[PDB]
Amino acid sequence: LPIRNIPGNYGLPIVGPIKDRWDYFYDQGAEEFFKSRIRKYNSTVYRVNMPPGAFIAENPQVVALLDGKSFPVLFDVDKVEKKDLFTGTYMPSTELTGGYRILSYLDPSEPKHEKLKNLLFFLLKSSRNRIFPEFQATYSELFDSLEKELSLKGKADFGGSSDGTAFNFLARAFYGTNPADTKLKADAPGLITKWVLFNLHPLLSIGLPRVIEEPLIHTFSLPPALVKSDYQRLYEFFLESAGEILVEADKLGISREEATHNLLFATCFNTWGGMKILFPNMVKRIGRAGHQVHNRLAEEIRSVIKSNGGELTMGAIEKMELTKSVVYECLRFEPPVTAQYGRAKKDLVIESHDAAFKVKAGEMLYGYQPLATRDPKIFDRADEFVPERFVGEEGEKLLRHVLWSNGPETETPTVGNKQCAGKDFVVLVARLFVIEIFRRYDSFDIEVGTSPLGSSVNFSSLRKA
Ligand code: HEM
8 A cells, every 4th residue: 555644733732622622522523523534634544633632631632543444453452552541642530440540541561451351351250140130130120110101201211210220230240239238229320420420521521512511521620539429339339249259359369459449440430331321322223223123123032032942041142143233233333432542652554445654653543433333445334224234154254343342343352452351241231132122022112312421212112022
């Protein structure tokens, strides 16, 4: 390929980054922010300023990688450093996380990265026999509540009940603990939401006027002191509930305190936060796919479960071709976590589709994942939600281009990489979610809005089997 100069610029000091931030949040929105510049520069690789800049991030300057050929450099731990960039060009105060740099912020070259990631692998494996029954019990109660609410109101707010369900499910599956039996009671979703906001506010908009938002959430960090007491309630829950897991932390040579802050983070931030975005998005996209698709899913799911003597098992799920494909298509079409960063460790030559580009050691690389996973040079019908996309031998080959987990779907998270520790768990619970819906309902209708993190979604009809 021809070597091209990386197009784009960072504009004026102070003023450049602020105007780019306004485009990003207000005047364009993330997707059009990136696409308008792809068009202008005639390039899927270019220089751009990223939020938050201001007083929160020291340096907003990045090289953006916006196609599925260039983007995977962000996975290569010999090319990029992945230290302290889980949230991008700033890092939330460690006062938010017990004074520890949590696993998500650690480069694989750090010894505690290996230890802590092994801890989470153990958490997931040891939970294996609890996931099915706890999912089916907690989500059954959720759909019961949504039916109740639909009968009362003519619509049922999915997110408003599902956030509690997801936390209860995780507490029961991971720690064999019902939060209703503890001091947390039903307060966890509110506590976690505030704490996550204190971490992520510089990257988020709530729809308030920019005159209010800019000074209040985009310029300076919210003080961690204001969420410390909330965080302490969560910590005491994890400390008291995670006994069996803490035994393994002891064996791995991790302090009880460090282990507990890490379990809190993986459970509340990575898992529950991830599910908070993913599940409503799934309900939205599957809802939009239409009743013929719903009927095909119901037919497949019910037939397979019947073939399996009414027992839902991992092997039965493997028979559910359309179900597996629809889950992968949700993750392709709308990756729940869209921003991945990496700092070049050495001089690199990054190949796009039609040119190569040279980046210097120390440059911050950034990828907006939906542009890599909806890349029309990789996927046909790239901007269409295609339920059956991954069905069959040929469809399955395309999984190497599904990147939700911060690596190819065909690859395995390891202590040597920064791929999502919960990769297999997420795909499993997403499948269980679709299964639970269509074993109960023939089809459904939705009403939808936006949310700081993804979508808000109401059911307006739930057609029982
Ligand atoms: C739908 C839910 C989830 C989504 C969308 C998601 C997505 C991601 C993404 C995109 C990253 C890469 C972060 C980066 O370096 O930019 C990541 C990392 C990580 N995730 Fe997940 N995740 C989810 C669930 C989980 C679960 C269930 C676990 C349970 C252990 C988990 C644990 C982690 C950990 C520990 C890392 C850092 C890995 C490392 O340091 O090597 N996540 N996740």
